[PDB]
């Protein structure tokens, strides 16, 4: 009834990019993590500011479209423009591939950091159930789930049972 990040992604999550689904005796409820989502959005907006800005260099006309320029310097200009646009096309393809790969790896790293954080909160009270979930052994209510949502979960209160 409940599955994890390793298995799939939840389409019902709308409050954020990374969420906490908990199955409990009281019921089933979901939320979102503000820290990991906010960090991912900040890094993606940092990428976007960096790229979206265009140049401030001013370029002139060097070729009259209406009246043809001498052929020799015209062929030199055409060869230089083709070489320059080949360089810029290669740089554009490379930059798009780099930022796409880095965005995917960035999201995977943020998920890994979140998963390690919830693992560090559950010292010896819970254990890892295969698909990206934690099987809680101690009886603890929705107050426990909201306490594990923030970084206020106490391990010593439930450690014995």
């Amino acid at each position: 009834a409940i599955a994890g990040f390793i298995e799939n992604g939840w389409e019902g999550l709308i409050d954020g990019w990374y969420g906490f689904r908990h199955q409990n005796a009281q019921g089933e409820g979901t939320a979102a993590d503000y820290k990991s989502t906010q960090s991912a959005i900040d890094q993606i907006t940092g990428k976007l500011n960096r790229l979206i800005e265009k140049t401030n260099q001013q370029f002139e006309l060097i070729d009259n479209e209406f009246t043809e320029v001498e052929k020799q310097i015209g062929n030199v200009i055409n060869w230089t423009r083709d070489s320059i646009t080949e360089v810029w096309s290669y740089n554009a393809e490379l930059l798009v591939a780099m930022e796409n790969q880095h965005t995917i790896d960035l999201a995977d790293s943020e998920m890994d950091k979140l998963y390690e954080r919830v693992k560090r909160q559950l010292r010896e009270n819970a254990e890892e159930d295969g698909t990206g979930c934690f099987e809680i052994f101690h009886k603890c209510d929705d107050d426990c789930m909201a306490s594990i949502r923030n970084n206020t979960y106490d391990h010593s209160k439930y450690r014995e049972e």
Partner: antibody
Amino acid sequence: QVQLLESGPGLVKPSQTLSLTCTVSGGSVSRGGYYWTWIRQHPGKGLEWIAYVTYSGDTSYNPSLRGRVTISLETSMNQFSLKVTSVTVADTALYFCARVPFYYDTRGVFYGNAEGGFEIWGQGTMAT
Amino acid sequence: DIQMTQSPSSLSASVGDRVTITCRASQGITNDLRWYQQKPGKAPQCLISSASRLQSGVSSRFSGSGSGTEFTLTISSLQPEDFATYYCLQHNSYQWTFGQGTKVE
């Protein structure tokens, strides 16, 4: 151009219920990722937070008066309403509604439209 | 009910003087403090979200800082249109509380 216009009676009998509806004139109220909040201030005092509701259903009324205020989200007529029962003289104040975003996006990576990331407040409707 | 205590309540300063203003929280509020400015008889508008950075559409002269229980907002240069009232909101817990009030003149 989302405008959080407010509607209300403006004249409240004592020890009766009061209905305050903040109509959302824009894209949608069912977008998600926003706190739909009610904020009030008596003149000469400070602002006092009342309640917040989301489309997902997370509702936390002010610890000050959990019983008196019931905030509900109504998708069909694109509004969220605040109802305060047993209205006294101290309950009379100037009321505001606000769309507080969950995250800070300048360029619209999560909200999508780059204007949804802003915090839009209502004009205000005084209630007696 | 993290107590939000602002101090001092009333400020008077000349045009072009830096205004150092303090917002005090009781608990270890972690990185959560929206700053609200409201003209008298006018809807409030946010200046500093997340306590260290500006909102778009707000002038860059507003600058906020501080972490933990101590929170500061700095104004580089006062304006005739800056006659207003400055608040601070916390949103770390499930509860939201305002401050008492800080007015510039």
